[PDB]
Design a protein around this nucleic acid. Structure first.
Ligand SMILES: [Mg+2]
Ligand SMILES: [Zn+2]
Lengths: 50, 157, 402, 1340
DNA sequence: AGCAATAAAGTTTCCTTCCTCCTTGCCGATAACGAGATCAACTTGTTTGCGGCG
């Protein structure tokens, strides 16, 4: 759930490094922002850090 | 209600089975003949059968000792399914370059559609719109490339 | 995270965060109404109480628990006692490329060798094997390597033999008191599940052969390989740094063999005849013509290097027991003959070793020791050796004293 | 002897006339639960004690009330075996009598208002076997019996707490059985203080006012009055002569007319004699003697009402004047012989701030209930509750009794609540030892420790549930309707069951049973602790209790308790140990009267003995006179010494009574070190039974009794003759006189075949009996796992001779032949259990089915259609058992596996596999399956098959049963037709049912046909009803957790023999590892070519002094020869009278062994079988301390025609030459253990990890990596090898990039390195900053 | 062999769409019972620091 302890927006999506449209994912092309949905993206596994 | 995070009519049913089961265990004077639950709560068997899951199974904590003092905890005895594995991505990349190895000899677009769709994870019919051939030929050449990569040997089957 | 039957498991911290949040939100809601202040007071005492209880539960005020009557563990104990990161998880470490088993003895061995049950090292040197199968082209890739491997072809074992020569290892008893509690040996494969081990280093390890277990570790890289070959290797580690003492003592058995040999009866036979050298005592006793333990005159050829580091040969005759004659056979060309002319108590052997090292250097002492083991165990077996109820002695003069 | 005993006799060399046969051994648990459940009317225990204790309950008003009457139980639905099979607890119902009575609150007690006298079910409870355990959920378990300190009173004194003083501080403690403790104590400065449950210090005297007492009465009680009297100007004073004792004269002590003690002068004993003598108390004295004295009692001006001096205030002469003026010619004051009579109370008082009672209650309240408003009644209520409410306080009159003894009252009994007199007595007794009189006492003295048992525990737990009930019960009494609210409408029965089920499942005490060997169970059941609740802990508790105390003698075995941290704490019961009715101990003793040992007994306490004297059994009786010798080593006073003969009161019975049975069984204990005996018997339990049951020869006598009461075996319930026999069961027919009339009297016995232990071992039973043979009652009919002919059999007896051999016996290591593995005679089994469950998901149900995708038919070939294996197969790691499958959802794939599908094109179903498979490393044999499925669900087909085959089993069994029974009854149903005529062969030839119509006469016999039909119909009725009941119970489905559909469960079988590494030892701590096996042909051998089995290291005989192992070794060689001499005769087939004589003389060797035997009694075939058994060797009892002698060992050996010392010439197998010296040779009886080579080994290259910190795990079960401690670091530092430890800290532990790229480099041939940083470090960083800190790092 | 056509078949999209359910928030109707404690801990223990505590 959002705005809770696991608000993934801040810490990171459980859908690990997925964007909104679901194009870029799972550590594959880290320094790519989803050009479709314009969602700037970081935190694959920085669920361990943020 | 704030602290609990489970729905409400859940607990209605729970209180209800509690009342009923005590009441009727007094009626009978002994236990555990579930068909009585079925009849008295004449809704369905699967109803309470599911409810039994839904309600009666609660939270537990992570670091509790493992019993006969502190040999280990529950944090030792844990299992996972989504692990890393090193050679599948390895041979995946081998097969990617084998795809290239097959298709670099083949029509100009199809190499490119399958490259840029399979390489950097871009769009497929994005090219079907570019050529505007109906993708009949696309279908055909996709099949032939499959037939050509049924020309190699690799386990991980 | 969830469980098999849908159940869950959690970290208590979360709970503590939540109460805080609830209280604060309440306080906002309250503040929007300008409410009578006493409520605010209670609200904030409960606030700060929640706060520090997050930090460290039962320090200021008494601690919060779950239903079990047990604390909701705070932060601090991520860091503290043994349980903390430092002493559990950071310094002392769980390890792969490691293993363990039970132990036993290889007497015949040479010190630098160590018994390996097959499948253990078989597993352990796995990626080396795979490199070699893609090298030879047997396993053109990785999969067939695995598959032939789980098929266990003769080539598999051949290739292991190729590798493990000169491929040393590390072995460990627990607990590690002094730095010799671990050493650096060289493999020898054996068909069992149990390690053989050179006897003498029971004492560096305080080991007794009655149910021990040891572990094994690996210098994967070369630096560590060479350090272990150079530093912890058994030849290097033979004297204490605490006190300049040989730690390699033959405790209890081979001592007895030598004492039984190197001994002077009068009784048996052949008393007082004449020989060229010890090789005739071999001729005789291996035919069984003489008591080994019998003072008889013979001739010996002793050496010293009293020159500026150059030998000085001489020879002369000796009324001596025969065992001494034999035991001169093995002495490596530096010693006098007085060395043997007693029936060899433990410390005599200590000084045997010491002196040998003092003058003649190192490796001769090593070999000298090894052969002492072999030969004394041999003649210990020859010895005839047991006890009885009838070997127990009662002095006739005890009852009267009492 | 008995039939079973005629089979195989074990000789004796004991010589002391035994009085007693050992009792039933595990009587105590049986007793406890028996008395717990039993309906006691009056002498309450457990249940009725609880009910009649919570005697009825009434409303928050006090208007209505339910009432206890009585109770009853049911019988269980299921038998034992179905319960253990089914996976369920074994339990009994409960049934309760109750009466809801109401009385009219209009009327004063108009009791006729309402009566609902009905019955009540509430809860089941568990019950016990005839063995001791409770099964739970199909799990056999054990709870332990506890020990702890009594309730009551306790005295002690610490020694220099504020060590600056180096001073004693006495104090007293009170511990109710239930309720609050209490502490009285002193301070450095001789003042009294008190605390409840270690509350803060408070003056004692406060409470005395809180109990409605004034200072006047206080010191009246505590202090005797020092009375001065003011006779018209001067001070005179009353004197007791023995107050001035060791004291010195303040002035001219004299008489009215006579001087006794001058100035400066000590009041010697003379002057005490004078003063008592010449009749003086009233003595003129200076007025100045007062100033410094204390007024006893608050003296006033009666006209004013003014405290001229408040009570407990020092005195003077201006106050003397004013008091003399007031009309007080007499002043009570306190006596102060600070030596003896110190005014400690006066001091403690005038330290105390308070006077009024009320505010004292207030201050106590405000202490214990801080901040809360001081409402009067609340303080009153607090105070009454803490010690004067039955609700929350009690003594367990044991407490009361012990206390009264500590009071030196008479009355054993009392209340559960305090009295004021008793408390006051505490105070005075405390101050009296503080003056010196009497003493504090000890803890280790067992007289202060009381044991504690199951029924008491159950008592406490269920009455806790009763209280939980009583809450809401009262809640709704006061309020709801009365007419309509039935009594059982109100209640719940969950919580009671919750208490019961938890500590039968949650307590530390409740434990699995240790199913390895008979000893394991019986002794683990006799095992004692002081831990758990109401007990102690390792780290806090120290040495004082761990050690020995003399009172343990004959109650506790000193020589069985482990080497771990829990050394001396737990300790086993002794042999003939019993419990006092209270929970204390006792032990039987032989009375010594007129010198004669009376043959009676008394089970005497842990206290009584300190008074009396005891004689020892090693003492030689003077044969119906007395003890022969004068100075008999007797014992008393926590010690022993030497006393006369007439002097003694009592004697022990045996020489054994001290030890445990585990201790008792090694022979020749009398010749070895203790710690050796410890480890010997400690590992002795830990053994394994072989396939076969080989005997020992050297015994003690007891093996039969433990063989019996373990309860593993068949038994002769009732005498008979063997009817039917088989590899799985038998049937017996019962003897007539024993056959009471009602039943046809045929026991049967279905046996337990290959079945699993909780230590995962092969369990089984087997006959040692034949067919067509009589049976006496009690005897056994089939052996258990590890025994033979009613005698223990848990190892094997084997040859050995000891000397070095080439460094294969360096330090105790062992070497053997190889024939014995041909015989497989230490080989054993480890069957393993495995399961797989179907569940209902959120989506839908898991399914079990043969069909699965991507399967090689090789796998499937061994499965049936539902996906289940055929019984009897042989299998291996990777093999599959159960085709369980899982309906799944979907995913968003990536082009990678997209193209793997493009290539492979194996379609993904909407289902996966979830199959059960053989774990890596394991291979074995299936022999059985079971399945469990819910009431509600279709029974998956093979479960129907097995329920059907079980019906075939069951109905066949019952068919057999009733067919036999009714076959007996057809005897009548033929015979009685014979009554009333004759159809001699026209009866029999024609079909038998068609006999009723045959020759038929009127008068009585129509009824005889009618009753014939009656019994027939009765019988078929029994048949049908029985079918119905049983077929239902079998067909009845299962009771399951939520989410479950059904389960399968599997067993396996694997068989283990030796590979080196294997551990073994004997009965003497003589541990051992194997280093090698030997071919025969290098074995040492003898004159006659016989090689040896086993070889050994004699350096470690004296080093630890396990010398008795020698003695048996002589015997180990010895009696063998006899059997050989007999087998020699046997194969020679000599003659019976030869056997007769030779045997009788074997038994007729000894001087004065008690047993003495004849055989002209016995028949020929008995000789034959006996001899045929003995051919292997003649077995013996060596009693523990009444053992045999060297005369006798050498006597048997000289008949055996051998070296007297039995130490003899041997030649080498290898080379074939004689050794130097002869060597002692013989047999040991030795063992194997469960610290096995395969059980322990593990390696690991690469695998799983952690997740929170990604580093590896530990455990062979979970493919574990090993640990590397700081100690190992420090060593490595010592050498100084950087790269090594660097590596193992980075790559083989955490650095993930590191591990990856190194693995890469290796398979590439590259042996090189690259480092990183551990994640765990940064984790620490993040914890730090979470703690609110700017932790950070300075970049280079 | 390369190239397209017609016809057929299966779709994924996908989008509404109206049934149905499900969950987020609120406010209400007779009158008065009692300031908690509640089921625990057994006092490790020696050394050392600091606040009182004179
Ligand atoms: Mg050891
Ligand atoms: Zn996107």
């Amino acid at each position: 759930e959002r705005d809770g302890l696991f608000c993934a927006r801040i810490f990171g999506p459980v859908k690990d490094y997925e964007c909104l449209c679901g194009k870029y994912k799972r550590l594959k092309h880290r320094g790519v922002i989803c050009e479709k949905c314009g969602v700037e993206v970081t935190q694959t596994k920085v669920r361990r850090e943020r | 209600r704030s602290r609990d995070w489970v729905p409400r009519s859940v607990r209605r049913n729970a209180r209800e089975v509690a009342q009923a089961i005590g009441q009727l265990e007094q009626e009978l004077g002994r236990n555990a003949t579930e068909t009585e639950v079925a009849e008295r709560l004449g809704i369905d068997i699967a109803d309470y059968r599911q409810m039994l899951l839904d309600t009666n199974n609660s939270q537990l904590f992570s670091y509790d000792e493992w019993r006969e003092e502190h040999g280990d905890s529950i944090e030792l005895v844990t299992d996972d399914h989504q692990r890393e594995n090193p050679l599948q991505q390895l041979l995946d990349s081998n097969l990617r370059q084998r795809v290239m190895e097959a298709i670099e000899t083949l029509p100009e677009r199809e190499k490119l559609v399958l490259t840029l769709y399979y390489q950097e994870e871009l769009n497929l019919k994005e090219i079907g719109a570019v050529l505007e051939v109906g993708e009949s030929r696309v279908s055909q050449l996709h099949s032939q490339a499959i037939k050509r990569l049924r020309t190699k040997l690799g386990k991980l089957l | 995270v969830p469980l098999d039957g849908g159940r869950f498991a959690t970290s208590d911290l979360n709970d503590l965060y939540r109460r805080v949040i609830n209280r604060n939100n309440r306080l906002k809601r309250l503040l929007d109404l300008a409410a009578p202040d006493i409520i605010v007071r209670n609200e904030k005492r409960m606030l700060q109480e929640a706060v520090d209880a997050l930090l460290d539960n039962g320090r200021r005020g008494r601690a919060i628990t779950g239903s079990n009557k047990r604390p909701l563990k705070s932060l601090a104990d991520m860091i503290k006692g043994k349980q903390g990161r430092f002493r559990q998880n950071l310094l002392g470490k769980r390890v792969d490329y490691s293993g363990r088993s039970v132990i036993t003895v290889g007497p015949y061995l040479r010190l630098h060798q160590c018994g390996l049950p097959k499948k253990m090292a078989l597993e352990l040197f796995k990626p080396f094997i795979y490199g070699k199968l893609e090298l030879r082209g047997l396993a053109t890739t990785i999969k067939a390597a695995k598959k032939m491997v789980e098929r266990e072809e003769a080539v598999v074992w051949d290739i292991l033999d190729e590798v493990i020569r000169e491929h040393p290892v590390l072995l460990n008893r627990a607990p590690t008191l002094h730095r010799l509690g671990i050493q650096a040996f060289e493999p020898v494969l054996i068909e069992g599940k149990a390690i053989q081990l050179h006897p003498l280093v029971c004492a560096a390890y305080n080991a007794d052969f009655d149910g021990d277990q040891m572990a094994v570790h690996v210098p994967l890289t070369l630096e560590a390989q060479l350090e272990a070959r150079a530093l912890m290797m058994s030849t290097n580690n033979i004297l204490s740094p605490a006190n300049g003492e040989p730690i390699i003592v033959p405790s209890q058995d081979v001592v007895l063999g030598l004492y039984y040999m190197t001994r002077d009866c009068v009784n048996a036979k052949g008393e007082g005849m004449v020989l060229t050298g010890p090789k005739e005592a071999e001729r005789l006793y291996r035919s069984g013509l003489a008591s080994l333990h019998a003072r008889v005159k013979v001739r010996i050829t002793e050496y010293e290097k009293d020159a500026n580091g150059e030998l000085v040969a001489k020879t002369s005759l000796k009324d001596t027991t025969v065992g001494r004659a034999i035991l001169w056979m093995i002495v490596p060309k530096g010693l006098p003959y007085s060395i043997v002319n007693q029936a060899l108590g433990k410390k005599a052997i200590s000084k045997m070793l010491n002196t040998c090292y003092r003058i003649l250097g190192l490796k001769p002492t090593v070999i000298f020791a090894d052969q002492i083991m072999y030969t004394g165990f041999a003649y210990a077996a020859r010895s005839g050796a047991s006890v009885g109820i009838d070997d127990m002695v009662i002095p006739e003069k005890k009852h009267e004293i009492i | 002897y008995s039939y079973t005993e005629k089979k195989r006799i074990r000789k004796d060399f004991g010589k002391r006339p035994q009085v007693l046969d050992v009792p039933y051994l595990l009587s105590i648990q049986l007793d406890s639960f028996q008395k717990f459940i039993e309906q006691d009317p009056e002498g309450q225990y457990g249940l009725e004690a609880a009910f009649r204790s919570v005697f009825p309950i009434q409303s928050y008003s006090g208007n209505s009330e339910l009432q206890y009457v009585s109770y009853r139980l049911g019988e269980p639905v299921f038998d034992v075996q179905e319960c253990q099979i089914r996976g369920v607890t074994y339990s009994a119902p409960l049934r309760v009598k109750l009466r809801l009575v109401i009385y009219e609150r209009e009327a004063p007690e108009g009791t006729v208002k309402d009566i609902k006298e009905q019955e009540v079910y509430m809860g089941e409870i568990p019950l016990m076997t005839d063995n001791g355990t409770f099964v739970i959920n199909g799990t056999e378990r054990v709870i332990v019996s506890q020990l702890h300190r009594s309730p009551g009173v306790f005295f002690d004194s610490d020694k220099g707490k504020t060590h600056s003083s180096g001073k004693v501080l006495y104090n007293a403690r009170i511990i109710p059985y239930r309720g609050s403790w209490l502490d009285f104590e002193f301070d450095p400065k001789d003042n009294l203080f008190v605390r409840i449950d270690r509350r803060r210090k408070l003056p004692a005297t406060i409470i005395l006012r809180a109990l409605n007492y004034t200072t006047e009465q206080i010191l009246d009680l505590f202090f005797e009055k020092v009375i001065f009297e003011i006779r018209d100007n001067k001070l005179q004073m009353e004197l007791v002569p023995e107050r001035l004792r060791g004291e010195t004269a303040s002035f001219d002590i004299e008489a009215n007319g006579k001087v006794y003690v001058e100035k400066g002068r000590r009041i010697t004993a003379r002057h005490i004699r004078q003063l008592e003598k010449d009749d003086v108390k009233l003595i003129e004295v200076p007025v100045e003697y007062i100033a410094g004295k204390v007024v006893a009692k608050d003296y006033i001006d009666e006209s004013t009402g003014e405290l001229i001096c408040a009570a407990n205030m020092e005195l003077s002469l201006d106050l003397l004047a004013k008091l003399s003026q007031s009309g007080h010619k007499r002043i009570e004051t306190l006596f102060t012989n600070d030596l003896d009579h110190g005014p400690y109370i006066s001091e403690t008082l005038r330290v105390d701030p308070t006077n009024d009672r009320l505010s004292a209650l207030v201050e106590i309240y405000r202490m214990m209930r801080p901040g809360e408003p001081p409402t009067r009644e609340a303080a009153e209520s607090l105070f009454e509750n803490l010690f004067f409410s039955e609700d929350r306080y009690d003594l367990s009159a044991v407490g009361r009794m012990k206390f009264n003894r500590s009071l030196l009252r008479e009355e054993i009994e009392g209340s559960g609540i305090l009295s004021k007199d008793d408390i006051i007595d505490v105070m005075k007794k405390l101050i009296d030892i503080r003056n010196g009189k009497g003493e504090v006492d000890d803890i280790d003295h067992l007289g202060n420790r009381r044991i504690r048992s199951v029924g008491e525990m159950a008592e406490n737990q269920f009455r806790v549930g009763l209280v939980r009930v009583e809450r809401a019960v009262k809640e709704r009494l006061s309020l709801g309707d009365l007419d309509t609210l039935m009594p059982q409408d109100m209640i719940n029965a969950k919580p009671i069951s919750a208490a019961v089920k938890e500590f039968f499942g949650s307590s530390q005490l409740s434990q699995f049973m240790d199913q390895n060997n008979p000893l394991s169970e019986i002794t683990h059941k006799r095992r004692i602790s002081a831990l758990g609740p109401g007990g102690l802990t390792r780290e806090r508790a120290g040495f004082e209790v761990r050690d020995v105390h003399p009172t343990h003698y004959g109650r506790v075995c000193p020589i069985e308790t482990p080497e771990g941290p829990n050394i001396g704490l737990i300790n086993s019961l002794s042999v003939y140990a019993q419990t006092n009715e209270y929970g204390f101990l006792e032990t039987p003793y032989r009375k010594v009267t007129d010198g004669v040992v009376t043959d009676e007994i008394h089970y005497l306490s842990a206290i009584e003995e300190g008074n009396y004297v005891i004689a020892q059994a090693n003492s030689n009786l003077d044969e119906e006179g007395h003890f022969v010798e004068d100075l008999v080593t007797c014992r008393s006073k926590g010690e022993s010494s030497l006393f006369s003969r007439d002097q003694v009161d009592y004697m022990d019975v045996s020489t054994q009574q001290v030890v445990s049975v585990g201790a008792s069984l090694i022979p020749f204990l009398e010749h070895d070190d203790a710690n050796r005996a410890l480890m010997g018997a400690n590992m002795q339990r830990q053994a394994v039974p072989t396939l076969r049951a080989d005997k020992p020869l050297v015994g003690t006598g007891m093996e039969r009794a433990v063989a019996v009461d373990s309860g593993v075996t068949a038994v002769a319930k009732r005498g008979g003759v063997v009817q039917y026999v088989d590899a799985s069961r038998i049937v017996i027919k019962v003897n007539e006189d024993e056959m009471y009339p009602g039943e046809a009297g045929i026991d049967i016995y279905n046996l337990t075949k290959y079945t699993r232990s909780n230590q995962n071992t092969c369990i089984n039973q087997m006959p040692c009996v034949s067919l067509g043979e009589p049976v006496e009652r009690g005897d056994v009919l089939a052996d258990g796992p590890s025994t033979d002919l009613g005698e223990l059999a848990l190892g094997q007896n084997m040859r050995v001779a000891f000397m070095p051999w080439n460094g294969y016996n360096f330090e105790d290591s062992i070497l053997v032949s190889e024939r014995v593995v041909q015989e497989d005679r230490f080989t054993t089994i480890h069957i393993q259990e495995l399961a797989c469950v179907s569940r209902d998901t959120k989506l839908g149900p898991e399914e079990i089915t043969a069909d699965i995708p991507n399967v090689g038919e090789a796998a499937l070939s061994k499965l049936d259609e539902s996906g289940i294996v055929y019984i009897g197969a042989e299998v291996t790691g990777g093999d599959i058992l159960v085709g369980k499958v899982t309906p799944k959802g979907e995913t968003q794939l990536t082009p990678e596996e997209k193209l793997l599908r493009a290539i492979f094109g194996e379609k993904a179903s909407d289902v996966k596999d979830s199959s059960l498979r053989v774990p890596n490393g394991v291979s074995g044999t299936v022999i059985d399956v079971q399945v469990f499925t819910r009431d509600g669900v279709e029974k998956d087909k093979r479960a129907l098959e097995i329920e059907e085959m079980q019906l075939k089993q069951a109905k066949k069994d019952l068919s057999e049963e009733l067919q036999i029974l009714e076959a007996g009854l057809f005897s009548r149903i033929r015979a009685v037709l014979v009554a009333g005529g004759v159809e001699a062969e026209k009866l029999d030839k024609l079909p038998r049912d068609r006999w009723l119509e045959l020759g038929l006469t009127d008068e009585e016999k129509q009824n005889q046909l009618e009753q014939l039909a009656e019994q027939y119909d009765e019988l078929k009725h029994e048949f049908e009803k029985k079918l119905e009941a049983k077929r239902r119970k079998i067909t009845q489905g299962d009771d399951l957790a939520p989410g479950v559909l059904k389960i399968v469960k599997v067993y396996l079988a694997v068989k283990r023999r030796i590979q080196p590494g294997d551990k073994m030892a004997g009965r003497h701590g003589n541990k051992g590892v194997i280093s090698k096996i030997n071919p025969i042909e290098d074995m040492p051998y003898d004159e006659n070519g016989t090689p040896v089995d086993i070889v050994l290291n004699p350096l470690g005989v004296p080093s630890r002094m396990n010398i008795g192992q020698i003695l048996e070794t002589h015997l180990g060689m010895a009696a063998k020869g006899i059997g050989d001499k007999i087998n020699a005769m046997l194969k020679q087939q000599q003659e019976v009278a030869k056997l007769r004589e030779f045997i009788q003389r074997a038994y007729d060797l000894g001087a004065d062994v008690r047993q003495k035997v004849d055989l002209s009694t016995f028949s020929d075939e008995e000789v034959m079988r006996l001899a045929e058994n003995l051919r292997k060797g003649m077995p013996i009892a060596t009693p523990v301390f009444d053992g045999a002698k060297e005369a006798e060992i050498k006597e048997l050996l000289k008949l055996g025609d051998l070296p007297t010392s039995g130490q003899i010439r041997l030649y080498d197998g290898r080379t074939g030459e004689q050794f130097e010296r002869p060597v002692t040779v013989g047999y040991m009886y030795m063992l194997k253990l469960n610290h096995l080579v395969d059980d322990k080994m593990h390696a690991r290259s690469t695998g799983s990890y952690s997740l929170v910190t990604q580093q590896p795990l530990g455990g062979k079960a979970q493919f574990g990596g090993q640990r590397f401690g700081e100690m190992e670091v420090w060593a490595l530092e010592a050498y100084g090898a950087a790269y090594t430890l660097q590596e193992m800290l980075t790559v083989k532990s955490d650095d993930v990039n590191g591990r990856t790229k190194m693995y890469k480099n290796i398979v590439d041939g590259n042996h090189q390195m690259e480092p990183g940083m551990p994640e765990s470090f940064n984790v620490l960083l993040k914890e730090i900053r979470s703690l609110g800190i700017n932790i950070e790092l300075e970049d280079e």
